Write a protein that binds this ligand. Structure first.
Ligand SMILES: O=c1cc[nH]c(=O)[nH]1
Length: 228
């Protein structure tokens, strides 16, 4: 009972079994899991274990329309909850997220913006918010970036993409563009500089949300209501 036990520890939705189960058997995965559990014995690891795989709960692989890649979770208590960039409902949006929400409103002036930074609505809509590193030590950015999450997540993404042609990938920044390299003839690959205001080009000028919806329409795929 490997999948059964793994799924129970992380409360993973069963719909993701075909994409994740094959990764469990890889010997490299065992090293990853043991290291993650070792870190939890020696430090404050975020987000909480029950939230690490929260991204599997909002939508099934077949509902995925857009994939947005991130680096690692927010590292202060209360911010991260398993979705890249999203913060729980009453936490003020951090700098990069603030720029993302700005670009959405610039693209869709009619979008019903709530003012919060919780992206669960997007997730249920098939917008997969995926960090390549799923955990972080409290207060230390990129601290868990070399423990092996990237190859596991990388394996799930390859499987998903091969399962469903015509996905839209939004790759913002140097890390995202080097981590994930989907076939641009089979999928819509959109690249931009990082959303942080420290980037040389203001992220508020990014048109990705509009361009993604035009691509979906050409494939007869229902476009996304980016209001959040
Ligand atoms: O989840 C998060 C938060 C900030 N930056 C990222 O790359 N991912």
């Amino acid at each position: 009972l490997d999948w059964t036990t793994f799924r129970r520890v992380f409360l993973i939705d069963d719909a993701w079994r075909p994409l994740m189960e094959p990764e469990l058997a890889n010997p490299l995965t065992a090293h990853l899991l043991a290291e993650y559990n070792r870190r939890c014995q020696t430090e404050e690891v975020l987000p909480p274990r029950e939230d690490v795989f929260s991204w599997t709960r909002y939508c099934t692989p077949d509902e995925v329309r857009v994939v947005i890649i991130g680096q690692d979770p927010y590292h202060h208590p209360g911010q991260a909850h398993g979705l890249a960039f999203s913060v729980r409902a009453n936490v003020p949006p951090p700098p990069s997220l603030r720029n993302v929400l700005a670009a959405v409103k610039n693209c869709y002036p009619e979008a019903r913006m709530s003012g919060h930074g919780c992206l669960e609505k997007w997730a249920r809509d098939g917008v997969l918010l995926l960090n390549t590193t799923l955990t972080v030590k409290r207060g230390a950015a990129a601290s868990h970036s070399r423990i092996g999450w990237d190859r596991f997540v990388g394996g799930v993404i390859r499987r998903l993409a091969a399962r469903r042609p015509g996905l839209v990938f939004m790759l913002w920044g140097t890390h995202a563009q080097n981590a994930i390299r989907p076939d641009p003839r089979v999928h819509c690959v959109l690249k931009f500089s990082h959303p942080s205001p420290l980037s040389k080009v203001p992220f508020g000028t990014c048109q990705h949300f509009l361009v993604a919806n035009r691509y979906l329409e050409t494939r007869s795929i229902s476009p996304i209501d980016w209001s959040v």
